[PDB]
């Protein structure tokens, strides 16, 4: 279950965040920790496509090789806080699992600048029981978390020492697919 009402960044700049580019997850914290593996790869693109607010997601378990992409149109709850109904797709946007009620995530941008961000998500998927997931993002897939984003982790009353890094997993990403999936 999720337990946090994440607070969006004061003065969040939506056009800068949703600029069509890619964000890589460098570090994550799930508050139900046995909900996700301890070794993982994830990234997203975020942008407006023909007037519609979109994200494209990529997940990869580097041990099992389990791989999936998703596309969503985000709905606005408030600035920096969204509800996203997702469809599982191949890398080319062909639908594998259609949008369905009950398959959605919330998405809150707690901090962002041009290069780094801190987000919260709460996934809802069928009858699964899932927890709060925080992720540190960077534009550069190899970037160590800087003091701006680490300060934001502290300001969220979290300990960055708790976060698990994705950097030692040899993660390789198809940026081209993420960007193109925004239109799908
Ligand atoms: C960047 C933020 C993230 C978002 C918005 C997000 C969103 C999602 C969505 C929508 C699904 C369902 C996909 C589908 O069934 O079509 C999913 C599944 C999953 N995510 Fe993420 N995720 C994110 C980051 C992560 C990270 C960093 C991890 C590892 C900690 C993770 C682990 C998982 C796992 C293991 C599943 C499979 C769940 C299941 O079906 O039981 N996610 N995520």
């Amino acid at each position: 279950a999720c337990t946090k009402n994440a607070i969006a960044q004061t003065g969040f700049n939506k056009d800068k965040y949703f600029n069509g580019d890619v964000w890589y997850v460098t570090d994550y914290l799930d508050l139900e920790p046995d909900d996700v593996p301890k070794r993982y790869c994830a990234a997203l693109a975020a942008g407006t496509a023909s007037g519609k607010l979109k994200e494209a997601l990529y997940h990869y378990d580097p041990k099992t090789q389990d791989t999936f992409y998703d596309v969503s149109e985000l709905q606005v709850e408030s600035l920096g806080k969204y509800t996203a109904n997702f469809k599982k797709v191949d890398k080319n946007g062909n639908v594998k699992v259609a949008v369905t009620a009950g398959n959605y995530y919330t998405f809150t941008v707690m901090y962002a600048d041009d290069s780094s961000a801190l987000i919260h998500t709460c996934l809802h998927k069928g009858n699964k029981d899932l927890g709060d997931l925080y992720a540190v993002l960077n534009r550069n897939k190899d970037a160590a978390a800087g003091d701006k984003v680490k300060s934001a982790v502290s300001a969220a009353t979290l300990e960055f020492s708790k976060f698990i890094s994705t950097k030692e997993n040899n993660c390789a990403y198809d940026n081209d697919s993420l960007k193109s999936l925004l239109t799908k």
Side-chain angles (χ1 to χ4, degrees):
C2 297
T3 67
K4 302 300 162 207
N5 180 3
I7 303 305
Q9 184 184 34
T10 295
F12 175 59
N13 189 327
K14 65 184 183 73
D15 289 357
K16 283 191 165 190
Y17 185 88
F18 293 101
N19 65 346
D21 197 10
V22 172
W23 288 105
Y24 302 98
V25 176
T26 63
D27 306 83
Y28 62 89
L29 178 68
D30 194 317
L31 297 186
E32 209 148 85
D34 310 314
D35 280 15
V36 302
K38 208 148 344 306
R39 294 181 112 269
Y40 215 85
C41 296
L44 60 88
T48 295
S50 200
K52 312 299 166 281
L53 195 68
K54 301 289 287 296
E55 291 177 339
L57 313 180
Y58 171 71
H59 286 70
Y60 180 74
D61 182 321
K63 291 281 173 204
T64 65
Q65 311 191 52
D66 187 49
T67 305
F68 47 98
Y69 290 90
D70 294 87
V71 178
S72 309
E73 179 176 331
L74 272 58
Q75 295 307 316
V76 175
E77 306 308 339
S78 57
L79 179 62
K81 194 167 271 261
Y82 310 92
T83 303
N85 282 284
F86 55 91
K87 47 188 190 197
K88 188 177 282 177
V89 294
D90 68 21
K91 70 191 190 104
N92 287 150
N94 304 304
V95 176
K96 297 167 51 126
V97 181
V99 167
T100 350
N103 280 10
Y104 68 96
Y105 58 99
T106 69
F107 190 87
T108 300
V109 182
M110 296 156 67
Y111 172 77
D113 55 41
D114 302 277
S115 295
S116 63
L118 175 63
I119 67 87
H120 170 274
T121 187
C122 178
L123 180 60
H124 299 262
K125 179 174 176 180
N127 59 22
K128 294 170 146 136
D129 183 46
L130 302 160
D132 300 271
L133 182 69
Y134 296 94
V136 169
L137 311 181
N138 204 278
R139 294 297 191 186
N140 177 332
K141 71 189 183 61
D142 287 313
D147 287 328
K148 309 178 70 186
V149 76
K150 291 183 192 186
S151 293
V153 171
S154 175
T157 314
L158 299 171
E159 290 287 321
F160 185 68
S161 56
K162 307 291 190 194
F163 281 61
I164 308 300
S165 182
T166 60
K167 81 191 172 175
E168 295 189 39
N169 303 140
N170 301 314
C171 299
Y173 300 92
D174 184 352
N175 309 308
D176 303 303
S177 291
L178 285 173
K179 286 176 161 167
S180 62
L181 281 173
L182 290 174
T183 75
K184 305 292 181 90

PDB file of all heavy atoms in Angstrom, residues 110-132:
ATOM      1  N   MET A 110       8.850  16.108  -6.982  1.00  0.00           N
ATOM      2  CA  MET A 110       9.141  16.742  -5.709  1.00  0.00           C
ATOM      3  C   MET A 110      10.215  17.814  -5.825  1.00  0.00           C
ATOM      4  O   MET A 110      10.249  18.780  -5.041  1.00  0.00           O
ATOM      5  CB  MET A 110       9.589  15.700  -4.690  1.00  0.00           C
ATOM      6  CG  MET A 110       8.474  14.709  -4.388  1.00  0.00           C
ATOM      7  SD  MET A 110       9.121  13.124  -3.774  1.00  0.00           S
ATOM      8  CE  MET A 110       9.792  13.702  -2.197  1.00  0.00           C
ATOM      9  N   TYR A 111      11.128  17.648  -6.797  1.00  0.00           N
ATOM     10  CA  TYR A 111      12.259  18.528  -7.051  1.00  0.00           C
ATOM     11  C   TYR A 111      12.651  18.313  -8.507  1.00  0.00           C
ATOM     12  O   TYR A 111      12.664  17.143  -8.940  1.00  0.00           O
ATOM     13  CB  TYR A 111      13.491  18.210  -6.119  1.00  0.00           C
ATOM     14  CG  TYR A 111      14.672  19.014  -6.580  1.00  0.00           C
ATOM     15  CD1 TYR A 111      14.792  20.366  -6.302  1.00  0.00           C
ATOM     16  CD2 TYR A 111      15.663  18.572  -7.481  1.00  0.00           C
ATOM     17  CE1 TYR A 111      15.788  21.218  -6.724  1.00  0.00           C
ATOM     18  CE2 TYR A 111      16.649  19.370  -7.976  1.00  0.00           C
ATOM     19  CZ  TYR A 111      16.712  20.681  -7.568  1.00  0.00           C
ATOM     20  OH  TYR A 111      17.665  21.550  -8.048  1.00  0.00           O
ATOM     21  N   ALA A 112      13.039  19.366  -9.212  1.00  0.00           N
ATOM     22  CA  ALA A 112      13.650  19.224 -10.521  1.00  0.00           C
ATOM     23  C   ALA A 112      14.476  20.466 -10.824  1.00  0.00           C
ATOM     24  O   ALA A 112      14.101  21.579 -10.465  1.00  0.00           O
ATOM     25  CB  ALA A 112      12.619  19.022 -11.615  1.00  0.00           C
ATOM     26  N   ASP A 113      15.557  20.227 -11.568  1.00  0.00           N
ATOM     27  CA  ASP A 113      16.240  21.311 -12.273  1.00  0.00           C
ATOM     28  C   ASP A 113      16.523  20.796 -13.677  1.00  0.00           C
ATOM     29  O   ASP A 113      15.966  19.825 -14.198  1.00  0.00           O
ATOM     30  CB  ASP A 113      17.473  21.801 -11.518  1.00  0.00           C
ATOM     31  CG  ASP A 113      18.431  20.672 -11.209  1.00  0.00           C
ATOM     32  OD1 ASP A 113      18.661  19.799 -12.031  1.00  0.00           O
ATOM     33  OD2 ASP A 113      18.968  20.618 -10.086  1.00  0.00           O
ATOM     34  N   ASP A 114      17.399  21.486 -14.417  1.00  0.00           N
ATOM     35  CA  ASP A 114      17.596  21.051 -15.770  1.00  0.00           C
ATOM     36  C   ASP A 114      18.192  19.642 -15.883  1.00  0.00           C
ATOM     37  O   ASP A 114      17.948  19.025 -16.947  1.00  0.00           O
ATOM     38  CB  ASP A 114      18.472  22.088 -16.511  1.00  0.00           C
ATOM     39  CG  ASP A 114      17.749  23.412 -16.422  1.00  0.00           C
ATOM     40  OD1 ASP A 114      16.851  23.702 -17.196  1.00  0.00           O
ATOM     41  OD2 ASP A 114      18.151  24.242 -15.584  1.00  0.00           O
ATOM     42  N   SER A 115      18.984  19.201 -14.878  1.00  0.00           N
ATOM     43  CA  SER A 115      19.762  17.978 -14.962  1.00  0.00           C
ATOM     44  C   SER A 115      19.326  16.853 -14.024  1.00  0.00           C
ATOM     45  O   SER A 115      19.738  15.711 -14.263  1.00  0.00           O
ATOM     46  CB  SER A 115      21.235  18.269 -14.679  1.00  0.00           C
ATOM     47  OG  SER A 115      21.721  19.116 -15.710  1.00  0.00           O
ATOM     48  N   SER A 116      18.573  17.164 -12.989  1.00  0.00           N
ATOM     49  CA  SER A 116      18.308  16.198 -11.923  1.00  0.00           C
ATOM     50  C   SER A 116      16.869  16.384 -11.428  1.00  0.00           C
ATOM     51  O   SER A 116      16.268  17.428 -11.594  1.00  0.00           O
ATOM     52  CB  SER A 116      19.268  16.368 -10.771  1.00  0.00           C
ATOM     53  OG  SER A 116      19.180  17.596 -10.129  1.00  0.00           O
ATOM     54  N   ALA A 117      16.342  15.309 -10.803  1.00  0.00           N
ATOM     55  CA  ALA A 117      14.977  15.402 -10.276  1.00  0.00           C
ATOM     56  C   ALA A 117      14.812  14.343  -9.193  1.00  0.00           C
ATOM     57  O   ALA A 117      15.535  13.339  -9.150  1.00  0.00           O
ATOM     58  CB  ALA A 117      13.941  15.212 -11.344  1.00  0.00           C
ATOM     59  N   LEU A 118      13.812  14.567  -8.341  1.00  0.00           N
ATOM     60  CA  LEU A 118      13.337  13.604  -7.351  1.00  0.00           C
ATOM     61  C   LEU A 118      11.825  13.453  -7.564  1.00  0.00           C
ATOM     62  O   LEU A 118      11.117  14.450  -7.543  1.00  0.00           O
ATOM     63  CB  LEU A 118      13.612  14.094  -5.930  1.00  0.00           C
ATOM     64  CG  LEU A 118      13.049  13.228  -4.801  1.00  0.00           C
ATOM     65  CD1 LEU A 118      13.663  11.852  -4.796  1.00  0.00           C
ATOM     66  CD2 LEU A 118      13.261  13.962  -3.466  1.00  0.00           C
ATOM     67  N   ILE A 119      11.394  12.196  -7.769  1.00  0.00           N
ATOM     68  CA  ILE A 119       9.974  11.933  -7.994  1.00  0.00           C
ATOM     69  C   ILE A 119       9.509  10.897  -6.978  1.00  0.00           C
ATOM     70  O   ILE A 119      10.279  10.095  -6.459  1.00  0.00           O
ATOM     71  CB  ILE A 119       9.687  11.499  -9.446  1.00  0.00           C
ATOM     72  CG1 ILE A 119      10.271  10.151  -9.829  1.00  0.00           C
ATOM     73  CG2 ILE A 119      10.187  12.591 -10.392  1.00  0.00           C
ATOM     74  CD1 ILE A 119       9.340   8.965  -9.489  1.00  0.00           C
ATOM     75  N   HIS A 120       8.183  10.902  -6.773  1.00  0.00           N
ATOM     76  CA  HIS A 120       7.452   9.865  -6.059  1.00  0.00           C
ATOM     77  C   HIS A 120       6.439   9.266  -7.028  1.00  0.00           C
ATOM     78  O   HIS A 120       5.800   9.974  -7.792  1.00  0.00           O
ATOM     79  CB  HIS A 120       6.701  10.469  -4.842  1.00  0.00           C
ATOM     80  CG  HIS A 120       5.746   9.520  -4.187  1.00  0.00           C
ATOM     81  ND1 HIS A 120       4.456   9.393  -4.666  1.00  0.00           N
ATOM     82  CD2 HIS A 120       5.887   8.706  -3.112  1.00  0.00           C
ATOM     83  CE1 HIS A 120       3.861   8.506  -3.863  1.00  0.00           C
ATOM     84  NE2 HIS A 120       4.693   8.078  -2.921  1.00  0.00           N
ATOM     85  N   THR A 121       6.284   7.944  -6.942  1.00  0.00           N
ATOM     86  CA  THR A 121       5.206   7.284  -7.667  1.00  0.00           C
ATOM     87  C   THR A 121       4.563   6.261  -6.758  1.00  0.00           C
ATOM     88  O   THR A 121       5.167   5.658  -5.886  1.00  0.00           O
ATOM     89  CB  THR A 121       5.764   6.587  -8.940  1.00  0.00           C
ATOM     90  OG1 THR A 121       4.743   6.056  -9.800  1.00  0.00           O
ATOM     91  CG2 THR A 121       6.915   5.657  -8.781  1.00  0.00           C
ATOM     92  N   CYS A 122       3.246   6.077  -6.981  1.00  0.00           N
ATOM     93  CA  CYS A 122       2.486   4.999  -6.391  1.00  0.00           C
ATOM     94  C   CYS A 122       1.813   4.226  -7.517  1.00  0.00           C
ATOM     95  O   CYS A 122       0.905   4.774  -8.165  1.00  0.00           O
ATOM     96  CB  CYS A 122       1.405   5.547  -5.403  1.00  0.00           C
ATOM     97  SG  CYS A 122       0.427   4.236  -4.700  1.00  0.00           S
ATOM     98  N   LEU A 123       2.266   2.998  -7.742  1.00  0.00           N
ATOM     99  CA  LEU A 123       1.711   2.163  -8.785  1.00  0.00           C
ATOM    100  C   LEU A 123       0.507   1.387  -8.263  1.00  0.00           C
ATOM    101  O   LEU A 123       0.531   0.827  -7.153  1.00  0.00           O
ATOM    102  CB  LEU A 123       2.806   1.179  -9.231  1.00  0.00           C
ATOM    103  CG  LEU A 123       2.426   0.195 -10.325  1.00  0.00           C
ATOM    104  CD1 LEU A 123       2.003   0.892 -11.635  1.00  0.00           C
ATOM    105  CD2 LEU A 123       3.576  -0.760 -10.626  1.00  0.00           C
ATOM    106  N   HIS A 124      -0.510   1.272  -9.101  1.00  0.00           N
ATOM    107  CA  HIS A 124      -1.670   0.443  -8.914  1.00  0.00           C
ATOM    108  C   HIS A 124      -1.800  -0.453 -10.140  1.00  0.00           C
ATOM    109  O   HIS A 124      -1.808   0.017 -11.277  1.00  0.00           O
ATOM    110  CB  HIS A 124      -2.936   1.313  -8.765  1.00  0.00           C
ATOM    111  CG  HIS A 124      -2.866   2.222  -7.594  1.00  0.00           C
ATOM    112  ND1 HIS A 124      -3.436   1.944  -6.410  1.00  0.00           N
ATOM    113  CD2 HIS A 124      -2.287   3.444  -7.456  1.00  0.00           C
ATOM    114  CE1 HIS A 124      -3.253   2.965  -5.571  1.00  0.00           C
ATOM    115  NE2 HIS A 124      -2.547   3.888  -6.182  1.00  0.00           N
ATOM    116  N   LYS A 125      -1.813  -1.765  -9.899  1.00  0.00           N
ATOM    117  CA  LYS A 125      -1.818  -2.698 -10.996  1.00  0.00           C
ATOM    118  C   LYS A 125      -2.667  -3.894 -10.557  1.00  0.00           C
ATOM    119  O   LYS A 125      -2.212  -4.699  -9.756  1.00  0.00           O
ATOM    120  CB  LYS A 125      -0.419  -3.089 -11.414  1.00  0.00           C
ATOM    121  CG  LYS A 125      -0.326  -4.093 -12.538  1.00  0.00           C
ATOM    122  CD  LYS A 125       1.096  -4.314 -12.997  1.00  0.00           C
ATOM    123  CE  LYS A 125       1.148  -5.408 -14.054  1.00  0.00           C
ATOM    124  NZ  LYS A 125       2.542  -5.619 -14.482  1.00  0.00           N
ATOM    125  N   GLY A 126      -3.919  -3.944 -11.056  1.00  0.00           N
ATOM    126  CA  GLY A 126      -4.768  -5.072 -10.728  1.00  0.00           C
ATOM    127  C   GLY A 126      -4.910  -5.241  -9.218  1.00  0.00           C
ATOM    128  O   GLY A 126      -5.154  -4.232  -8.511  1.00  0.00           O
ATOM    129  N   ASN A 127      -4.738  -6.468  -8.777  1.00  0.00           N
ATOM    130  CA  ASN A 127      -4.870  -6.793  -7.354  1.00  0.00           C
ATOM    131  C   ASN A 127      -3.511  -6.889  -6.657  1.00  0.00           C
ATOM    132  O   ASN A 127      -3.541  -7.404  -5.549  1.00  0.00           O
ATOM    133  CB  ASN A 127      -5.689  -8.060  -7.141  1.00  0.00           C
ATOM    134  CG  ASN A 127      -5.097  -9.284  -7.828  1.00  0.00           C
ATOM    135  OD1 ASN A 127      -3.919  -9.339  -8.130  1.00  0.00           O
ATOM    136  ND2 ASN A 127      -5.967 -10.249  -8.037  1.00  0.00           N
ATOM    137  N   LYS A 128      -2.460  -6.349  -7.249  1.00  0.00           N
ATOM    138  CA  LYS A 128      -1.170  -6.313  -6.547  1.00  0.00           C
ATOM    139  C   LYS A 128      -1.205  -5.336  -5.371  1.00  0.00           C
ATOM    140  O   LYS A 128      -2.069  -4.434  -5.353  1.00  0.00           O
ATOM    141  CB  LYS A 128      -0.091  -5.941  -7.560  1.00  0.00           C
ATOM    142  CG  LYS A 128       0.088  -7.031  -8.610  1.00  0.00           C
ATOM    143  CD  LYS A 128       0.920  -6.833  -9.844  1.00  0.00           C
ATOM    144  CE  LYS A 128       1.615  -8.133 -10.271  1.00  0.00           C
ATOM    145  NZ  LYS A 128       1.575  -8.432 -11.717  1.00  0.00           N
ATOM    146  N   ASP A 129      -0.324  -5.572  -4.382  1.00  0.00           N
ATOM    147  CA  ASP A 129      -0.152  -4.631  -3.240  1.00  0.00           C
ATOM    148  C   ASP A 129       1.237  -3.976  -3.353  1.00  0.00           C
ATOM    149  O   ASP A 129       2.237  -4.682  -3.115  1.00  0.00           O
ATOM    150  CB  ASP A 129      -0.234  -5.359  -1.918  1.00  0.00           C
ATOM    151  CG  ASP A 129      -0.127  -4.382  -0.760  1.00  0.00           C
ATOM    152  OD1 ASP A 129      -0.753  -3.312  -0.687  1.00  0.00           O
ATOM    153  OD2 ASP A 129       0.651  -4.674   0.144  1.00  0.00           O
ATOM    154  N   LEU A 130       1.295  -2.755  -3.732  1.00  0.00           N
ATOM    155  CA  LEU A 130       2.510  -2.020  -4.084  1.00  0.00           C
ATOM    156  C   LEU A 130       2.674  -0.814  -3.167  1.00  0.00           C
ATOM    157  O   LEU A 130       1.675  -0.280  -2.689  1.00  0.00           O
ATOM    158  CB  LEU A 130       2.423  -1.613  -5.559  1.00  0.00           C
ATOM    159  CG  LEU A 130       2.238  -2.864  -6.465  1.00  0.00           C
ATOM    160  CD1 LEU A 130       1.671  -2.402  -7.797  1.00  0.00           C
ATOM    161  CD2 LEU A 130       3.516  -3.591  -6.613  1.00  0.00           C
ATOM    162  N   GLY A 131       3.923  -0.401  -2.945  1.00  0.00           N
ATOM    163  CA  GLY A 131       4.310   0.687  -2.096  1.00  0.00           C
ATOM    164  C   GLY A 131       4.768   1.942  -2.815  1.00  0.00           C
ATOM    165  O   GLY A 131       4.904   2.100  -3.994  1.00  0.00           O
ATOM    166  N   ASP A 132       5.051   2.922  -1.971  1.00  0.00           N
ATOM    167  CA  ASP A 132       5.602   4.199  -2.391  1.00  0.00           C
ATOM    168  C   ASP A 132       7.012   3.951  -2.973  1.00  0.00           C
ATOM    169  O   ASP A 132       7.813   3.297  -2.353  1.00  0.00           O
ATOM    170  CB  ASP A 132       5.783   5.153  -1.214  1.00  0.00           C
ATOM    171  CG  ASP A 132       4.469   5.465  -0.506  1.00  0.00           C
ATOM    172  OD1 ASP A 132       3.782   6.418  -0.883  1.00  0.00           O
ATOM    173  OD2 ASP A 132       4.166   4.690   0.479  1.00  0.00           O
TER     174      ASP A 132
END
